[PDB]
Amino acid sequence: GEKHITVTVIHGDQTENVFEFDTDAKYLGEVLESENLVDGESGEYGLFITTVDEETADDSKQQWWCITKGGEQVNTSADQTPVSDGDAFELTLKEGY
Ligand SMILES: [Ca+2]
Ligand SMILES: [Ca+2]
Ligand SMILES: [Ca+2]
Ligand SMILES: [Ca+2]
Ligand SMILES: [Ca+2]
Ligand SMILES: [Ca+2]
Known part of the structure; x- marks a missing residue:
């Protein structure tokens, strides 16, 4: 079934980019890679x-x-x-631990 989700990217300079997906993916990586949003x-x-x-x-x-x-x-x-x-x-994007 189709799920409606959002993925917000919080960049190093605090820029937030919001991405909406309408997806039948089971897992988050499949969603992210559907649009090549990550490597x-x-x-x-x-x-x-x-x-x-x-x-x-x-x-x-x-x-x-x-x-x-x-x-x-x-x-x-x-x-x-x-x-x-x-x-x-x-x-x-985090720095350190
Ligand atoms: Ca629902
Ligand atoms: Ca639904
Ligand atoms: Ca929508
Ligand atoms: Ca982009
Ligand atoms: Ca990739
Ligand atoms: Ca790549």
């Missing part, structure tokens, strides 16, 4: 997202893309994150 690499814990909406995290400055769902922590890699109708996800 990531496979690995043993799932997708490691390096670039979102044409912004690449600088590994050397401890930057990384973080997935949240209505601001709440998401425990799964994007390719293992189930999508529900009405979901709002965020991808935020």
